[PDB]
Amino acid sequence: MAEKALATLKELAFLEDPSPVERDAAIQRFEYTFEAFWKALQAYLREKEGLEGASPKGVIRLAREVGLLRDEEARLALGMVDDRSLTVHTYNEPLARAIFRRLPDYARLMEQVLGRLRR
Amino acid sequence: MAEKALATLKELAFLEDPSPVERDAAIQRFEYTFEAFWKALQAYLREKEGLEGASPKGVIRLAREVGLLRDEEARLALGMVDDRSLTVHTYNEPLARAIFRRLPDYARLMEQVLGRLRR
């Protein structure tokens, strides 16, 4: 689901001044895009590297050691996992706006990583 | 707090034909409203009934066994718990749409219950 889910996210993640509706929607899409994203990395690491990761953070650490993620990408990824744990408290405009400000980078990172995963 | 989160969910829950952005936003607000909702229930049971629940379903059963929720409401509440988690791989149009269809009842249930934690 990665790529296609990533497409719906990009529709809103690059909005300069989103309304509260668009913003909440961008957060929801980030959620399901994230889940599809770490799952694709997990399966890839399993099938192509023989490395097994159980959680989003563990998979990112293995993706880093194998080279799928440069150290900087890795850290941005780990930040993505933490923001994922905060989406359920985005009733607060501050948080919500703060998460939305990071979506641009997350969208690009995921798009670029998925690309390399083409085998 | 939970009533304010719930207020923003009501702005979208009752739309007959939401745009795709309005539907994803309504699902996001259901997630952060339910989180606020079971936490409020949990706090209330702890402080007013000497009952410490530690999980969303655990808190819902306790509220039922204390009279806050009729048996029907409790079954709906438990279904909310399952949905708030399926809200993960949501670009599953069928699923997102099935959850949206239930928002009017979820929103009305939470409004009622929260109303009993005060009056």
Torsion of CA B2, A35, B59, B42, to 10 degrees: -40
Q: Where are the alpha helices (DSSP H) in A14-92?
A: 20-44, 56-66, 71-86
> Which residues in chain A touch residue B24, judged by CB atoms under 8 angstroms apart?
24-25, 28-29
Say what the resolution is, in angstroms: 2.1
Long-range Cβ contacts of A85-89 (<8 Å, 24+ apart): A87/A27, A87/A30, A87/A31, A87/B28, A87/B31, A87/B32, A88/B31, A88/B32, A88/B35, A89/B32, A89/B35
Between chains, do A36 and B5 touch, taking CB under 8 Å as contact? no
Through-space distance between the first and last CA atoms of chain B, rounded to whole angstroms = 16
- HSE-CB of B94 using CA atoms within 13 angstroms: 0
Please indicate the experimental technique that yielded this structure.
X-ray
Calpha distance B119→B108 (Å, rounded): 17
Rounded CA separation B52/B57 (Å): 13
Say how many CB pairs under 8 Å bridge A and B: 65
> Which of A5, A28, A36 has the CB atom closest to B28's CB atom?
A28
Residues of B with CB below 8 A from A21's CB?
12, 21-22, 25
Compute the distance between CA of residue A105 and CA of residue A13 in angstroms, rounded to an integer: 9
Separation of alpha carbons B63 and B74, rounded Å: 8
HEC sequence for chain B: CHHHHHHHHHHHHCCCCCCHHHHHHHHHHHHHHHHHHHHHHHHHHHHHHCCCCCCHHHHHHHHHCCCCCCHHHHHHHHHHHHHHHHCCCCCCHHHHHHHHHHHHHHHHHHHHHHHHCCC
At position A65, the amino acid (one-letter code) is: E
- Which CATH number, 1.20.120.330, 3.30.43.10, 3.40.50.300, 3.40.50.1820, labels domain B2-119? 1.20.120.330
Domain parsing of chain B, residue ranges: 2-119
What does the alpha-carbon distance between residue B88 and residue B79 come to, in Å, rounded to a whole number?
15
Q: Does B81 touch chain A (CB under 8 A)?
A: no
Q: Quote the minimal CA–CA distance from A4 to chain B in Å.
A: 9
Which of B56, B108, B103 lies closest to B78 in space, CA to CA?
Answer: B56
Structure tokens at A25: 């929607």
